């Protein structure tokens, strides 16, 4: 199945959780393909890819090449599809290339049928763009990554979550009265909340520094175990 | 004058810092106007503006009204120009209204030439929108807000800051090894980094819940003092 990850706000931990979840799902004896559609292109650097490597499916289509040749093999049961680097001229003028990336949906669909991968995780930004909407629609299920703060509390009551998406709490902290109050309010105000939450674990902060997923970098850390529980939940509930 | 605060990555605290900076400058006796360029309309909620207040300069411009009537006066020395809550359909297709907000640049030029406002803070998004590029163009100074972590460090080597911007550190922890290493490397490598940094404080997380700027919420807060120092620094250099 195709599981799409998108955050209610940039920087809540969507890419880190995407890499960790892909690593965990693969460790459970499963072929996993993780695709970064967020143009920031920060999912690569969690998988020990050289920074100078500018190859990516978006870049492959922007140069007229084949997007499929941009694939990477991390382990025998984990694959990567880098977004690719965009020039400063490309970064400051997003309209000139946003509409030229629509073809990727058909390739993702044909891959979803290839039967090669049992999970297709997609890291999506919150730019409300055409590509983001098309890729979120392609996903069989969705995960919304939030943190327990006032900003996400407001965003939950003013912006539209993906249809049927599950709220996943990330970056839960220790000794914050406001965080506890908002969590209590969500326990009965929100029906889509997942039973598992990822804590503020220093392993998560270091994992991108080490260019490794949190499961590989330090499997004894609480964050790795929480991501493991989330992977089990995806297996048991998001099978179809 | 026109001090644009923009986050290098979302969630660093551009909005709460902007509210705090507005409050600190208004304590210093300067005429301050905060204009929310963020479409998510969180700046209004920080100045005790009710969630139901749909009015805003962008909504007024789309609806053909005069944005000059969309403001609120918080104290004698602080004015707000909220973005205005947009409908769900409007949020789904931003490309249908991004190009229709051109006159705000002329209005801000008029306000700058007015001289009534010695400071005009602008809370900006990071979406590469044409409106945001224009707003940065009319800004006299820019502050890029980063957090000390791998994400911001990676961004700083690949995404283009506004020209002349100064990097401000927010959400600084105590005893994080990767954070300390990145901080030292930043000190010895980043030329534009500001001498002040804002520590993580429960005051900043509680200010938005109380719908007040962090300075008014608790003036003894460490982040409040840091924001006041930043305001004085802007007075000294950005004037």
């Amino acid at each position: 199945a195709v599981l799409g990850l998108q955050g209610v706000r940039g920087g809540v931990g969507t890419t880190t959780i995407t890499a960790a979840l892909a690593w965990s799902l693969q460790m459970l004896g499963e072929n996993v393909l993780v695709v970064d559609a967020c143009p920031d292109n920060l999912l690569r650097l969690s998988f020990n890819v050289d920074f100078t490597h500018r190859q990516g499916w978006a870049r492959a289509m922007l140069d007229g090449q084949d997007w499929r040749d941009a694939g990477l093999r991390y382990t025998s049961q984990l694959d990567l599809l880098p977004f690719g680097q965009l020039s400063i001229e490309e970064q400051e003028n997003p309209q000139h290339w946003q509409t030229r990336l629509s073809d990727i949906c058909s390739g993702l669909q044909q891959l979803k049928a290839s039967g090669r991968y049992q999970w297709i995780l997609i890291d999506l930004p919150r730019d409300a763009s055409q590509i983001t909407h098309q890729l979120l629609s392609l996903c069989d299920h969705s995960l919304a990554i939030v943190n327990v703060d006032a900003n996400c509390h407001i965003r939950l009551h003013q912006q539209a979550l993906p249809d049927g998406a599950h709220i996943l709490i990330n970056n839960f902290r220790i000794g914050s009265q406001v965080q506890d109050d908002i969590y209590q309010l969500w326990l009965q105000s929100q029906r889509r909340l997942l039973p598992m939450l990822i804590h503020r674990d220093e392993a998560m902060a270091e994992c991108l520094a080490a260019k490794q997923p949190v499961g590989e970098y330090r499997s004894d850390a609480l964050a790795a175990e929480e991501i493991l529980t989330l992977a089990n939940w995806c297996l048991l509930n998001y099978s179809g | 004058a026109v001090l644009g605060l923009q986050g290098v990555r979302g969630g660093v605290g551009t909005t709460t810092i902007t509210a705090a900076l507005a409050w600190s400058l208004q304590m210093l006796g300067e005429n301050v106007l905060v204009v929310d360029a963020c479409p998510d309309n969180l700046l209004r909620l920080s100045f005790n503006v009710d969630f139901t207040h749909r009015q805003g300069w962008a909504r007024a411009m789309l609806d053909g009204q005069d944005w000059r009537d969309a403001g609120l006066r918080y104290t004698s020395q602080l004015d707000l120009l909220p973005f205005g809550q947009l409908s769900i359909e409007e949020q789904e297709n931003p490309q249908h209204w991004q190009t229709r907000l051109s006159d705000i640049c002329s209005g801000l030029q008029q306000l700058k030439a007015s001289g009534r406002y010695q400071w005009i803070l602008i809370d900006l998004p990071r979406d590469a929108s044409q409106i945001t590029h224009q707003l940065l163009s009319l800004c006299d100074h820019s502050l890029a807000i980063v957090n000390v972590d791998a994400n911001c460090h990676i961004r700083l080597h690949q995404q283009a800051l506004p020209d002349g911007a100064h990097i401000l550190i927010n959400n600084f922890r105590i005893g994080s090894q990767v954070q300390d290493d990145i901080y030292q490397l930043w000190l010895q490598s980043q030329r534009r980094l500001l001498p002040m940094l804002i520590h993580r404080d429960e005051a900043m997380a509680e200010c938005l819940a109380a719908k007040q700027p962090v300075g008014e919420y608790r003036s003894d807060a460490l982040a409040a003092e840091e924001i006041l120092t930043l305001a004085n620094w802007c007075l000294l250099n950005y004037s």
Binding site: E206, K211 | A150, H153, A160, D181, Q184, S189, R191
Partner: peptide, 29 residues
């Protein structure tokens, strides 16, 4: 932006920081 990566290996603490974390060293070359 403004980055001055020259003359980095002249400091011990920065050397330890670069050794510990591959990403920082990768940027510093």
């Amino acid at each position: 932006p403004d980055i001055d990566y020259a003359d980095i290996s002249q400091r011990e603490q920065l050397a330890a920081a670069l050794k510990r974390w591959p990403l920082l060293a990768e940027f510093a070359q």
